[PDB]
Amino acid sequence: SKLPLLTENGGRVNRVGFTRIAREGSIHKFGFFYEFTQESIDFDSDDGLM
Amino acid sequence: FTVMTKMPGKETADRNDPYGETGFSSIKWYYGILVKRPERLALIKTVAPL
Numbered sequence: 001s002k003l004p005l006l007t008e009n010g011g012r013v014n015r016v017g018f019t020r021i022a023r024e025g026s027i028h029k030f031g032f033f034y035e036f037t038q039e040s041i042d043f044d045s046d047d048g049l050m
Numbered sequence: 051f052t053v054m055t056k057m058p059g060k061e062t063a064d065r066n067d068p069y070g071e072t073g074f075s076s077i078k079w080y081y082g083i084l085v086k087r088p089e090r091l092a093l094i095k096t097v098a099p100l
Binding site: 006008009010011012 | 065066067068069070071072
């Protein structure tokens with residue numbers, strides 16, 4: 001019932017349209033840290049602690 | 051005589067017929083006469099046999 005049929009006289013028949021879509025995404029921020037003292041390094045048994 | 055002919059195709063493709071399925075041919079002209087000496091035009095009116 002929706003086939004674009006055409007007669008020998010043509011005319012303004014079977015017009016169509018188009019569409020488009022948009023996608024999006026965003027970034028975020030992360031981080032963490034730790035703290036220490038000089039003694040916690042110098043007097044510790046393991047010299048490879050850091 | 052002025053003759054204008056457009057055959058079906060891109061020549062006749064417009065907003066009213068996007069497919070250009072029809073053509074046409076036309077003829078036109080101008081005509082007129084000036085009677086300078088009407089008395090030199092002689093006419094007899096009569097009936098004619100079957």
